[PDB]
């Protein structure tokens, strides 16, 4: 009756959305970019091999100065590195060794953590006493914290294992905004350059674009067929790349409201773990479970480079704000800088 | 800053991490008595029991690919949920990221199984049709004054778990089944001995002696 009509009308809405998207797909992006010359082979060397972590590393985040770095390991350590001199700027033990995410504030005065403890820990690095202490302990999530990004020094956006995202205020300490709608576990999120919008990928094979102020799911993309592990905006801010467990990467455009390109190969059967974009967005870097990273041409959907040297699964990947170098951390307790 | 990291590395390598996995009413907390620490023969074992997450165990379980062992506690008295326990054990055993971690199986509440099987209200044959075509293993060692029926049922359950364990490769990791009553003070000793065996096997594999 009413409920059957509810599913019927939802199905017809989905069909209408699919028809509209198909109508908007007048031409493919791959054929339009055929005219430009290929990027060619990309060669990168391991400039630095960062050592000192005990267990597997999950998260890293480059600083705004493109020199400081942060990493989180299962031994219970959050280490802030100086990439230029390979010196440990800071090394903070964690109350819970089960940490799966970390963040670095744009101002550089704060860092973030979070993991199986269901709690996001914010640490201050500019204490008057010159000792890093737990600045705040944000709690209220009923699932493990998978990603966290600092909007500013006052508010932070996190994603939890309870299929929800939360915008917290550091001064208040409470959930300023709650984003719900994801069916599967939310695994990663990215902040758009305009700071107004942000995408989130979950274990429902779908991505959702949310507005920070509105607090509602502005847009939804359903192109993947497996769990989504990573997401990152294009530098222009009008597109984003998503990596999933189905060994494919997909580029979506906010205005196009559908897929643009798919990056995959027959010999690849390992799911994506981390994705990132270059400074100009021409090169898309993707970590893989086959112990190596792949650099694809974002405009031709062909592999342009292979980054090898990790003997364990690559977990985190990050490109500097100026695009000078890219840092890759794997489950081998080592970080490698490539340029 | 480096000396503190060296001490942290020493203490981290000194202790051995275990992952406690068990459904409700199995009695996982009673095995030793959300983290617990104990010391046996001057070596420290830290057991982690995750219970604050949802039923989606696909993702966060990847955090436990470096633990020494997985203490899998299963209730052998409830002939109904047994199938769910077998499915969970098979999923844990056949995991891509848990293929190198040994599993120590604890059949908790053997006594309740005893009263249930002597009661006669519930028969294993109804839920396990292959129990009728089963015989007690020759190598099985029963207790003094111990009923053949209860040992037959418990060894049938143990062999049913061992079939799943041996279906996949056993060279990379092994399963150690044990019988646990309602309360036991030898659980820590059994865990210590099984960890001894696991680490010795890993050392021999590194030595190419096995």
């Amino acid at each position, epitope marked *: 009756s009413e409920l059957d009509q509810l599913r019927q009308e939802a199905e017809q809405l*989905k069909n209408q959305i699919r028809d509209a998207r198909k109508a908007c797909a007048d031409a493919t992006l791959s054929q339009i970019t055929n005219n430009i010359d290929p990027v060619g082979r990309i060669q990168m060397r391991t400039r630095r091999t960062l050592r000192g972590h005990l267990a597997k590393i999950y998260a890293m985040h480059w600083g705004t100065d493109s020199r400081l770095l942060v990493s989180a390991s299962q031994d219970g350590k959050l280490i802030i590195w100086d990439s230029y001199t390979t010196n440990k700027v800071h090394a903070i033990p964690l109350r819970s060794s089960w940490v799966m995410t970390c963040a670095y504030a744009p101002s550089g005065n704060y860092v973030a953590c979070g993991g199986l403890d269901n709690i996001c820990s914010i640490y201050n690095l500019k204490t008057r006493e010159g000792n890093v202490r737990v600045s705040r302990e944000l709690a209220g999530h009923t699932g493990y914290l998978s990603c966290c990004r600092f909007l500013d020094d006052n508010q932070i956006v996190t994603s939890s294992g309870d*299929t929800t995202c939360a915008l917290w205020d550091i001064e208040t300490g409470q959930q300023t905004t709650t984003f719900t709608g994801h*069916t*599967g576990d939310v695994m990663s999120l990215s902040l758009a350059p305009d700071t107004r919008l942000f995408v989130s990928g979950a*274990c*429902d*094979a*779908s991505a959702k674009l949310w507005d920070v102020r509105e607090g509602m799911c502005r847009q939804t993309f*359903t192109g993947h*067929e*497996s*769990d989504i592990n990573a997401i990152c905006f294009f530098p222009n801010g009008n597109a984003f790349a998503t990596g999933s*467990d*189905d*060994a494919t990467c997909r580029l979506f455009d906010l205005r196009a409201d559908q897929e643009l390109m798919t990056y995959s190969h027959d010999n690849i*059967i390992c*799911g994506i773990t981390s994705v990132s974009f270059s400074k100009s967005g021409r090169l898309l870097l993707a970590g893989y479970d086959d112990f190596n990273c792949n650099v694809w041409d974002a405009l031709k959907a062909d592999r342009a480079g292979v980054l090898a040297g990790h003997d364990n699964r690559v977990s985190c990947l990050g490109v500097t704000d100026d695009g000078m170098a890219v840092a890759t951390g794997s489950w081998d307790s080592f970080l490698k800088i490539w340029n | 800053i480096e000396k503190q990291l060296q001490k942290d590395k020493q203490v981290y390598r000194a202790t051995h991490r275990l992952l406690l996995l068990g459904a409700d009413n199995s009695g996982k907390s009673t095995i030793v008595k959300f983290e617990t620490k104990f010391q046996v023969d001057k070596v420290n074992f830290h057991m982690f029991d995750v219970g604050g997450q*949802r*039923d*989606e*165990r*696909r993702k966060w379980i990847q955090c436990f690919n470096d633990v020494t062992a997985i203490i899998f506690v299963v209730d052998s008295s409830d002939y109904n949920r047994l*199938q*769910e326990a077998l*499915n969970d054990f*098979k*999923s*844990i*055993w*056949n*995991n*891509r990221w848990l293929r190198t971690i040994s599993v120590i199986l604890f059949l908790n509440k053997q006594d309740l199984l005893a009263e249930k099987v002597l009661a006669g209200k519930s028969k294993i044959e109804d*839920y*396990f*049709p*292959e129990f009728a075509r089963y015989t007690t293993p020759e190598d099985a060692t029963p207790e003094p004054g111990e009923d053949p029926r209860v040992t037959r049922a418990k060894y049938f359950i143990r062999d049913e778990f061992l079939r799943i364990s041996t279906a*996949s490769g056993d060279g990379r990791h092994y399963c150690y089944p044990h019988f646990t009553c309602a309360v036991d003070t030898e659980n820590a000793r059994r865990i210590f001995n099984d960890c001894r065996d696991i680490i010795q096997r890993m050392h021999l594999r590194q030595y190419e002696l096995l």
Partner: nanobody
Amino acid sequence: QVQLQESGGGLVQPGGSLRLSCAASGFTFSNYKMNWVRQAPGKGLEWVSDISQSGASISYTGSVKGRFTISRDNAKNTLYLQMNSLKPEDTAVYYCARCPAPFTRDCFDVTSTTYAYRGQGTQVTVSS
């Protein structure tokens, strides 16, 4: 988008035969292991059958071993579950679940009503 539509079932005489079909779209059916899970009224989800990618490996729960059969057709991306000699304990909602990890042996699809890769299911009941 991943879609798993279940068809068939309904009211059947005890001891009869029934056929359940599962149509899969949005993904390659041959690259994933398929499962059939039943939920009884007032009871949680339980796994009742599973079939591997190529169909070489097929397993059933103890309550249906031999009694039921499962098959897959990758040419038109379909799953079939044939049930013979229905019993009153078989009155349940059946779900065709495509577990997420491809090219893997294990997978989790018995989660409590929170699973994006499971169909709506069909009701199977026996006449009194």
